[PDB]
Design a protein around this ligand. Structure first.
Ligand SMILES: O=C(O)c1cccc(/C=N/OCCO/N=C/c2cc(=O)[nH]c(=O)[nH]2)c1
Length: 223
């Protein structure tokens, strides 16, 4: 089992020796000595384990990992069996059900099936102290995940970026929309879902855009 996916390591390792990155590694390591930190070390980079970097087709940008026990596992919005899907994820599934006629609810919250198809599920901040939202904010992760976004922007074409909420929209603000597709709507959390996310139909729209990029569509029910 790898800590960090091989193909991703090849293209992102230029970040590793930078002052901010060493500092970030030290911050997280010190946090883990005194607190419970999610996800566990072996799951921080799950987003690098599921597909080759060259095989990314769709990018969903999140903010903070889930901060409750057993929830975060390195893919944004996703929870491994048998953890119940959180409200945000139930909303994602609800939109899918109305957006795509034939989408079936998988009865779990594990989005590994999407990740394997090249759906990058990247949170901007990759660790969080248990029960404390945004506890690891602005400690170095943002610069690293910005580098991930910048790499994909510069080194692939016809990606579909899905930016849900103002935070994701900001993080995706410098994406080249001549070379990539960008869809924007409200965050799927209960507090914002009815301000755009329900009825956004990003999942069907994504597959149409992928065809225009000459790429095979995502099977959203393959979970
Ligand atoms: O950026 C916004 O506009 C906005 C508006 C309303 C709400 C939120 C965020 N709400 O977050 C709490 C809901 O649960 N979040 C789950 C989550 C899991 C994950 O892995 N990554 C996330 O970004 N989020 C953002």
């Amino acid at each position: 089992m790898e800590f960090f996916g091989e193909s991703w390591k090849k293209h992102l390792s230029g970040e590793f020796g930078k002052p901010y990155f060493i500092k970030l590694m030290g911050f997280v390591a010190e946090e883990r000595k005194h607190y419970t930190v999610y996800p566990p070390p072996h799951q921080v980079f799950t987003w690098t384990q599921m597909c080759d970097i060259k095989d990314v087709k769709v990018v969903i940008l999140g903010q903070d990992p889930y901060h409750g026990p057993n929830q975060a596992h390195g893919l944004c919005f996703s929870v491994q069996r048998p953890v119940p899907p959180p409200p945000s994820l139930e909303n994602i599934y609800k939109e899918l059900s109305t957006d795509i006629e034939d989408f079936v609810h998988p009865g779990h919250g594990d989005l590994s099936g999407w990740a394997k198809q090249g759906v990058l599920l990247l949170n901007a901040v990759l660790t969080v102290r248990a029960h404390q939202a945004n506890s690891h904010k602005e400690r170095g992760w943002e610069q690293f995940t910005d580098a991930v976004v910048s790499w994909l922007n510069q080194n692939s074409n016809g990606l579909v970026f899905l930016l849900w909420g103002s935070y994701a929209q900001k993080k995706g603000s410098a994406i080249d929309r001549k070379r990539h597709h960008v869809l924007q709507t409200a965050h799927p959390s209960p507090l914002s879902v009815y301000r755009g996310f329900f009825g956004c139909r990003h999942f069907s729209k994504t597959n149409e855009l992928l065809q225009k990029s000459g790429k095979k569509p995502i099977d959203w029910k393959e979970l």
